[PDB]
Design a protein around this ligand. Sequence first.
Ligand SMILES: Nc1ncnc2c1ncn2[C@@H]1O[C@H](COP(=O)(O)OP(=O)(O)OP(=O)(O)O)[C@@H](O)[C@H]1O
Ligand SMILES: Nc1ncnc2c1ncn2[C@@H]1O[C@H](COP(=O)(O)OP(=O)(O)OP(=O)(O)O)[C@@H](O)[C@H]1O
Lengths: 228, 377, 370, 219, 248, 228, 51, 239
Amino acid sequence: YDRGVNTFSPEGRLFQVEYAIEAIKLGSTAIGIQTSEGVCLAVEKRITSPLMEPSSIEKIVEIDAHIGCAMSGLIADAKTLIDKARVETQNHWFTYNETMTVESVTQAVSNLALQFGEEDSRPFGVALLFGGVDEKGPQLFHMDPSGTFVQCDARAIGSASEGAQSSLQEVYHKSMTLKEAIKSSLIILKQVMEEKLNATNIELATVQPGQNFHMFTKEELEEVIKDI
Amino acid sequence: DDIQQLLKKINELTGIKESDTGLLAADKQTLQSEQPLQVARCTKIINADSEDPKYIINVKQFAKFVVDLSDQVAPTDIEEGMRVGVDRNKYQIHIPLPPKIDPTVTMMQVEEKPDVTYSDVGGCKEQIEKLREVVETPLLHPERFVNLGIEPPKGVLLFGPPGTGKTLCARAVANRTDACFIRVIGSELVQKYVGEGARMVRELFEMARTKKACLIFFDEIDAIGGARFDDGAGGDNEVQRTMLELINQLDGFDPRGNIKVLMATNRPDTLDPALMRPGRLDRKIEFSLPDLEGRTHIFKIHARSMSVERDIRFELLARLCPNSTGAEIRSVCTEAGMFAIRARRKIATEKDFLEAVNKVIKSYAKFSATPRYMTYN
Amino acid sequence: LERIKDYLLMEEEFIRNQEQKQEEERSKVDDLRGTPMSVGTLEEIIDDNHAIVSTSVGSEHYVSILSFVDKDLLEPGCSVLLNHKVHAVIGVLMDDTDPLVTVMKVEKAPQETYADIGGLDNQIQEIKESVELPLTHPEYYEEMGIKPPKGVILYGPPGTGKTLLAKAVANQTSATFLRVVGSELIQKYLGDGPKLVRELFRVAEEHAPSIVFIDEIDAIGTKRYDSNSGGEREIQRTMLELLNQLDGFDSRGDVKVIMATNRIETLDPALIRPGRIDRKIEFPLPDEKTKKRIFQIHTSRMTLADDVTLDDLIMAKDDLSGADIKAICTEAGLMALRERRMKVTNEDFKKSKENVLYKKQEGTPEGLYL
Amino acid sequence: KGVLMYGPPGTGKTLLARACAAQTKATFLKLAGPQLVQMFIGDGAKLVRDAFALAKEKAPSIIFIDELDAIGTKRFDSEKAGDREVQRTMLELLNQLDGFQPNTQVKVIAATNRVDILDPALLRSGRLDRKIEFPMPNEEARARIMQIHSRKMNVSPDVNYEELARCTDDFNGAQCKAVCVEAGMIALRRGATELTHEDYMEGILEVQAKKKANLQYYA
Amino acid sequence: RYDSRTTIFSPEGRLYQVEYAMEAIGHAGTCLGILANDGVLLAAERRNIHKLLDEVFFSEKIYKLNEDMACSVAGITSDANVLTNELRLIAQRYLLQYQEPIPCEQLVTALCDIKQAYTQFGGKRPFGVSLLYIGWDKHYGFQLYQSDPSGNYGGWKATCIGNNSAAAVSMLKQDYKEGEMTLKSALALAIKVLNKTMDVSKLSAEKVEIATLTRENGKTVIRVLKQKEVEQLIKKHEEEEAKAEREK
Amino acid sequence: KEIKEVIELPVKHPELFEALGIAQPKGVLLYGPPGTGKTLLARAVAHHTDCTFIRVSGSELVQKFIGEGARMVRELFVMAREHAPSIIFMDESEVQRTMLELLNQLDGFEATKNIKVIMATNRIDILDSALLRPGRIDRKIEFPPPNEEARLDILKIHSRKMNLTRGINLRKIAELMPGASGAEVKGVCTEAGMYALRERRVHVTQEDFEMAVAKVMQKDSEKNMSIK
Amino acid sequence: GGRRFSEGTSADREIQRTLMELLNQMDGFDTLHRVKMIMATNRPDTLDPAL
Amino acid sequence: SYDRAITVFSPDGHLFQVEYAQEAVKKGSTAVGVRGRDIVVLGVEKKSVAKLQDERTVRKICALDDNVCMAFAGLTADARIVINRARVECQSHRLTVEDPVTVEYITRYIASLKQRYTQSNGRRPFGISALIVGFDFDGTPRLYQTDPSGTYHAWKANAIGRGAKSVREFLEKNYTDEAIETDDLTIKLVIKALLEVVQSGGKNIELAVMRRDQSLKILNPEEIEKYVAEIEKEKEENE
Ligand SMILES: Nc1ncnc2c1ncn2[C@@H]1O[C@H](COP(=O)(O)OP(=O)(O)OP(=O)(O)O)[C@@H](O)[C@H]1O
Ligand SMILES: Nc1ncnc2c1ncn2[C@@H]1O[C@H](COP(=O)(O)OP(=O)(O)OP(=O)(O)O)[C@@H](O)[C@H]1O
C-alpha cells in the first residue's frame, strides 16, 4: 500500500506529490511583493541558537544580477536548482548575449520539477518564489514541486501562509509602492511570527529597474524595523 | 526504640484494661397484616384459547401449564407474552405488569438533565439552527410541519474535528430536551455472544416505542460497523449482523415513530451507504473549526465564569489560535486561570493568557513529538 | 531487645481486636424476620410497598419490605433478604465485596511520603496543585471558579520512580485509590476489555472521590499475543471504550485519572489532547546532585562508615535512577554480607559498582561504531 | 420457487413488500436476517422450522426476507476460527426450504443490497427462481417519483420537474424525497407561501452535497 | 514481495546481517596471534578431524598471502578463499605497482572496504568471516590485525575469536605477558590457552595447528612448523602441568 | 551452593539481612539446557527448606484451583501469603507475561516475604530486558551440561539402586556418553535392565549398557555436515 | 461435520464430540450390518479427514 | 509513510531513515572543537584502551589538506570512505587549482555527495556527522559541521556524541569573547570542555591543535594532566 511514484489515487494523483506539497508547510514563511517600482521580498530565518550564525542561513540567493530567489523546504535540493538554474541562464547569455527571461528560467527549472526517476531520483519537496526584472519590468513568480507554475502579484508561502495570504489580500492593491509594501510586508511578518522582530529574524530582497543590482537591504533593514 | 516501643506499650496497656473495663414500630403490625398476603409468582404467557381464558403459561424454567385466571383480573389484557401475577397453589392470574426490559440496558437512560446550554456551543450557529429545526421544533411545536403537510427529518449525522461540540450538542439538547433522552455508546454492542447485540437493538427500540416523542443518541458509531467486508476468514461478523439489525430494527417495515436519533463519529468516511442513505439520516450536519471571532465568543464563554482583568482582548489570542479546538481553548482559559491560582491574585491578566497560549501551544503542541533537527529552515 | 514490646503490642492488638432483651419492638421486628432469612435479588421496584424480586433459580415475586430499613437503600441489582413464608423483603443486606475491590482498592498508604524523592519538587508541585490542591484545598476554585486539571501522564526511562511517585501519592491520599497494570486489558475472550472499563470506572465512581492510577498503558498498543481472540479490532474497541469513558458525558466527577508510560510516541494523540489529560509531565533523569540525596535515602538506615565519596558514583555513569543507586546499595550489601561485615567499605561499592553497571550498563555486542 | 430482490439499497425493496402485501390479501410473512441466528447453538433451526410450520399451516404463505445476505455467506474451510451457526441456520433454510419433502404453498421473496456474499447453492436454479435486479430511475422516473412525493404538498406549480430530473443525475427515490421534503423546509425558511421552483433548486443543492472542491493540480 | 533487509537498519536503529554474521563467526574454530617481537606466531584449531581424510593440504586456516604475511581465518571457507585470492590479487597488484610489498594496513582497510561495500549497497549476503593478519614491515615490524564484517579492523597484540575464545581472551588479559618476545613461552602460554579453551582431551596435535613468521635477514621466513615439535610442546606443556601439580 | 546462599539464607536468616539493613533477593532466573535437573533442583531445595513448592504453568485447571479462572492469577498471592514460605517454579511470552505482572506487584507492593518465584529455561534473550532490570532480576544462574565425571556421578545415582552384575564398571560408560541429561542416563540404566530381562536376567551386565548407549545414541547422528 | 478448530467457539466442542459420536459409533468394535449410510453435501472439501 | 525506503515520504512528509541515520550519530563517541583566533583546537573523548591492541589505527582525527582538520560522528568505516574520498577530492582540487583547498568547497563536496548519495537507490546513507576545521583565507579560523541529511553548517564552537546539547549548553555557559586572542585561554577553554566531558576521565581525552600556519599538533596526557591540575586549582580558586 502507500502507492508511491507509480500509482495514482483512485480519484486524483500521486499520494507522494501530495506528500511533497504537504511537506512544504513545515518550512518557514516568505513574502515577496511585486511592486511596479520593484519587487521586494522577505523571509523568516527562524534562528534557534546563539551560536547559530545568522548570515550562514541563506534564503534569498542571486541567480542573475537582477534575479533573486526564495525557497521553501528542502535546502540543498533547492540550492542544486539554484546552481543549475544559474548555469542555464549562463547558457542563455552564453548563446544569446542576453539574460534569460525569468519566466523561461522558471520553465527551465519547471521542466525537471517533475522529472523524478527511479527507473528509465525521488521527487522534491521545495516551493519557490522568484524575483526578477525582465524586459516587461518587475516579475514575481511562484512555482511548486508539482511544477504548476504561476506568476503571483504578492505571494506568501510556508507556515501560516493562509492568514498571511489573506491579510495580504486585505492590504494589497495594484498601485502599491515600494516602501509601503516593505513596511506592510514586515507588519504581516511580525503578525505571523512568534519571535521578537529584530535584525536577525528577517532579510530583504529589493529588485528595481534602477536598482536591478542589490536584492538586499544592509542594516538600514534595522532602520526599517525601527520605522514601524 | 524506647520512645516508640514504650509509648506503644503504654497504648497497649491502655487498651488492655479498657477491654477488661468493658466487663421498630413504624409498620410492624401492618407487616403482621401482610403475613396473610400472598407471594405472587409472576410467569410468562404463551397463548390463550377461544371464547374462554384456558391460558397456557410457563413460569420461566419449570414447565408449561394450562391454567386459569383469578376472577379479579381485567380478563382481556392477559394476552400473549405478558408477564402476569400467578398464585403458587391455584396458579391463578392477578395483574399484568410490564415485562423484563434488560439487566444493564435500562442503565443507559440518562435519567437527568445536564446543564449544557445552547449559548455555550457558540460559533456553529447554522448547526444550532438546523439542529433546533430537526430536534426542538417538531417535538414541542408542530405548528408548521403538520399545518402544511411536511415531515421533520428523523435522523441527523454529526462529525467534525475532535473537540468541536458533539458532546456539547448532545448534552445541550438534554438541557431543553422535553423528551426521554437515551445515551448510546457504540461499544455497547461489544458483547461476547452471537446475536446478543441484536437483542440489544430489540430492547433498545422496545424502550423507544413504549414512551412517546423521545431521544436516543448514538456515540462512536465506528464500532457499530464500517462496511460489508468479505474475506475467506470469517472476521467482522457479530458487528455486521448487529449493524444490519440496527438498520432493520431502526426503520423499515413500520418505522420508529416519534423518536429522534443523532449520530456522531470522527471518521464519517468509512461508513456503509445503507446508513449514509437518506430516510435513515437526512441532514448530515457536520462540524468545523472555529475560524473567526466565534473563537472570541468561546473565550467569552470560558472567561465569563472567572474574575479577569477588565482591560483584556480576545481577538489577539484568537488570531494566535487559528486551528485550535474549543477543548484547547478551555485548556488555555482555565490554564491561564491556573497561572492566576499560582499567583496570589484573584483576577487573571492578558499576560497570563499569554502564559497559557505560549505554554500550551509551544510546550504541549510542539514538544509532543520532539524535533531534534533543523533540516528545514 | 524490643521484641517483647513488639510481640506484646501485637498480641494485645490481636486480643483487643478479638474483644468484639431490653428493646422489645426490635425483638418484634426480629419476629417479623423469619429464622431462615433467605436471600434475594432485585429486578424492579414498584412504589406500592412491594416490588418484584428474583430467586436463586428465578422464581420472582411481588413482595413487601419490612418498613423500618429504607427502600432508598434498595437499587436494581442489589442483594436483599427474603422470607420463606410470604417471601417478603426482610431488609437491606450488606453488599458483595468483589475481588475487584479487595484486589484493586488499596487500603494501605504503602511506603514513604515526599522524602523519598530525588530531582523532584517541580513534579511534586505539579501533582500537588493538579491533584492534591483539587483534593485537599479546592477553595481557590471557589475564589475564581475555574476547573481543575483532569489527567496526569508520567513518562520517562524505566526505574525512574514512577513507582516511587505513584506510591508517594498513594501515601498522601484521602481518596479511594485504585491501581491497574496496563497489560491486564487483553484476555482470551471477545468483548472483555470494554466491560473491564465499564465496571472498573463504575466501581471508581460509586464509592467516593477516587484516584485511579494505571501504569504501563502502552502495553495494549504495541503488544501482540496468540492468547487473544480477534485482535487489533478488539484492542481498538477497548481503546474506544477507554476513549468514551475518559471523555464521556454527564459530570465525570472527582476521579483523578493518573497514568504512566515509558515511551510516549506510540500513543493516541486523541488521548494526548487536553480535556482528557491536562498535565502531561516530563520525567527526565534529574541531576547528578540529587544522586547524593538518593544515596542518602537508600543508605540512611544502614550501618556504613565513610570510606567513599558519592562523586565516585557520580563520575561513573551518565543515567541516574533509584534503580541504579538502589542496586548499588543492595549489591554492596550482598558484597558486605558476603564478606560477613557491617559498616560497608569501599570495595563493596567498587565491585557492586562494576556489577551493577555491567549488569545492564553495556550495549550491543561491542565494536558497532564506537 | 422464490423471487430475488437485489441491486442498490435506495431503489426500494421495502416498497414491494409493503406494496404487494398492501394489495394482496394472502398470508404475508416477514423475516429478518440476524433475528434467526441466536445466542445458543441450534435455536435458528427451531425458529426457521417453526416458521415453516406456521406458514405451512397458513397455505397462501408469502414470506418476505429482509437482509438475506446477513445469514447468506460464502463459507470457508480454515483453522483456528469460524462462525458456523450462520451456515447452520442457513442450511436449515436451504434443506427445509427446498430439496427433500417439497412444498407447493411457500412463496419466497428476498431483499438484499449486495450480491456475491451468497452461495451459488442459495439460488442455484430456483432456490430463489427469479433474479430481479433493480435499476435506478433513469430520467423520467426521477421526476415521476418527485411527482409522487410532491403530490401531497401544496405547490405553486411554476416548476418543471424535467429540469430537475434532467439536472439531478443518478439519485434514488429517497434522495428525490429528500429534494421534496428539504424543498418544503426551504420553503419554510420563508414560511410564507407554497413551493417555488427555487425551493426545489436549493433542496437539490443540499442533496447534491458532493462538494469535494479538491481542484488542485488541475488548474 | 521477496525482499530481505540486506541494506537496512533494524527499527530502533541497529543492524541485522552484521549481528547474525558475528553469530556465524562465534560458532567456529579458534586461532590466535601472540606477542612476539622477533617474529610472530599463530595457533589454530583443526575442524572436521575425521580420520578418513588425506590432510595433504598443509594449510587449512593459514594463508601465506604474499611473502612475509599470512592469515588465519574464521567463517565461510570458500567465501574466504575468494577473499584470499582477491587479497593476493590486491597486494600482488601493489607489488606490481611499486615492486614493493604492502605496508599491510591499506590492504587490511581495503578488504574492509570490500566487505563494507556489500554491507552498504547491493543487498546480498555479506561475508560472515573474521580473520587474522600477521606480517612484517619496515615501519612497525611484525604486526597483528583483526578483520571485521563491519568494515572495522584491529591493530592487536592479543586477538579474539568467537564463543570458544572469550575465555581465551580473558586468559590473555589475566595472563597477559609483556616485554618478552620469547616464542616458546608464547607456545606454552598458547598451549595453556588451547589446553583450557580447546576441549580436546590432552590437546591432540591433529586437532590443532601452529605456524610462525620470523625475521631472517631480509627474507622474513614463515615457519609452517610440523607435528613432532607440537608433540614435544604437548609433553612439555603437560610437564608444565606436572609443575602445576607440584603444589598439591 | 548458590541457591543455598540466595534462597536458604532468606529462609534461615532474615536477621542477618535486616542486621545491616539490605533488601533480600526475590527473583532468581535459572537458565540452561533441558534435562539438566531444572525442576529437581528447586524441588530438592524447597523440600529441604520447607517451603510450599508451587508450579503454575498454563492450565484452566490451575486457574480453577487458584480462583475459578475468573480474572487473573493474583489469588496465588493469597495462597502464597497464607503459605508465606512459598517457592514457585515456572516453565518456558505467556507464562513470562504472567511472571511479568506477578513480579510487577511482588516487588515492594506486598507483605511478609519468603515468597520467591523461580523460572528455569533456555533462550535468555526472548524474555524482557525490562524484566531483566537489575532491580528486578539478580541471579541468572547457568546450568552446565554434565561432563564425564558429572555423568559418572549421575550414572552412579541412577544406577546405584538397581541390581547390577557382580563385576561392573561405570567410568567406561561415563566415557561412552558424549553428554546426556539427568534423565537420559536413567533410560540407559532402566533399558539396560530391560536388556537383562530379555536375557531373563536381573543382573545388568556391561553389554546391556553397551546396547543401552547404542539405544540412546540415536539422539545425535548424521555426519557429512561438518560445515561450521 | 466440519474439519477441526483450534479450540475457538465453545459450542464447537460439543459439535466435535457429537461428531466423534459418529466417528466412533460408525466403526466401534461391533460393526454394523446392512446399515447403508448415504451422504450428501455441497462442498466436500470442508469435511473432516477423520470422516 | 513507513520507516523503510529512503525514497518515500511520510503522510506529513518525512524521511525516517535520515532520522535513523541521526540516531547512531547521536549514539556515537563525543568530540569537541573550537576555533582560536589563531590557534584552532579540538579533541575527541573516550579513548578507552583495552590493554591488548594498538590505537594509532583507531585515530579519529586526520587531515585532508594541511590547512584543515578532520573529525566525524557516528560510525568509523563510512567516515573512512568519506575521508579517503575527500583526500582524492582535496588533492584533485589541489591538482586543478593551485589554491589552498577551502573548507566551504570541500564541505559542499561532502554534504553534496552525502545528499545525492542519500537520493540514490538501494544505497545505505552515511550515518556520520563531520567536524571540519580550516583556517585558510589569511588563516581565518572556520569550523563547520555536517548532517546525515548532508547539510554543511558553520558554528563557532562544537560538541557532538552523547550529551552534545549538555556540553553545548556548557559552551553556551562558557562562550567568552576573550577565550580567543589569548590562545592560552583557548587552551584553558579546551581544558574546560574536556573538563566538562561526560566522563571527564583525564586519560581518555585526545586533543589536537593548530596555530593556522602550523601542522596538526598532538598533545600529551601529562600536559593535559597539568591542564586538569590547573582546572582543579582554578576550582580551588573559586572555592
Ligand atoms: N465551540 C465550542 N465552544 C465551547 N466549548 C467547546 C467548543 N468546542 C469544543 N469545546 C469544548 O470541548 C469539549 C466539547 O466536546 P467534544 O467536541 O470534545 O466532544 P467530541 O466531539 O465527542 O470529541 P471526541 O470525538 O474526541 O469525544 C468540551 O470540553 C467543551 O468545553
Ligand atoms: N419507484 C419509486 N416510486 C416511488 N418512490 C420510490 C421509488 N423508489 C424509491 N422510492 C422512495 O425511496 C425510498 C426507497 O425505498 P426504501 O428505502 O423503503 O427501500 P430500500 O431500503 O431502498 O430497499 P433496499 O435498501 O433493501 O434496496 C422509499 O422511501 C420511497 O419513498
